[PDB]
Design a binder for this molecule. Sequence first.
Ligand SMILES: CCCn1nnnc1NC(=O)c1ccco1
Ligand SMILES: [Cl-]
Ligand SMILES: [Cl-]
Length: 182
Amino acid sequence: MFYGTVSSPDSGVYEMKIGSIIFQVASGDITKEEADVIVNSTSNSFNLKAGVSKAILECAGQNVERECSQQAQQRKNDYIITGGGFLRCKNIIHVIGGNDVKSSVSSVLQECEKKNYSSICLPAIGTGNAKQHPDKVAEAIIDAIEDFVQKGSAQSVKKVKVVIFLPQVLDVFYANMKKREG
Ligand SMILES: CCCn1nnnc1NC(=O)c1ccco1
Ligand SMILES: [Cl-]
Ligand SMILES: [Cl-]
């Protein structure tokens, strides 16, 4: 009803269509990517500096760190939106690694439509300090995108890319894409 064919457009990149959205996966350092939004996977205090979160806050810089702690003390947040700092993006959306991954990705997609953004880059949310299982994380990320497309909500969003720190986790995402393909 939605899934296209899995192929490799560039060395180390694997893609398929989900409705009108191009979904891609690759291994690498997410802080070297350019996109309208980059997603951080962090703690419920939005101040963690371990794994992906360490790289994102160090690269983004101290003003982004300060924006995070200011919003954390203002109210109870499921996620927060900051500037991009010295990352190559318009905004960072910081999600909680321990939360339901399908819910977190659905929120990211909705916030990107609100800003008329076209591109998103995310890590394998939850697979760091939160120690969620990679197979369940891949299923949840792709399920969120399918639901967004099924509801007719994809208008501005055209490209969603997962950049994954460990090659072994990339293999789990690729297998899930092959399970779903048309
Ligand atoms: C310099 C050695 C790399 N390294 N070693 N242990 N953890 C990391 N890094 C990350 O988890 C990470 C995510 C994105 C960029 O870095
Ligand atoms: Cl995590
Ligand atoms: Cl990752």
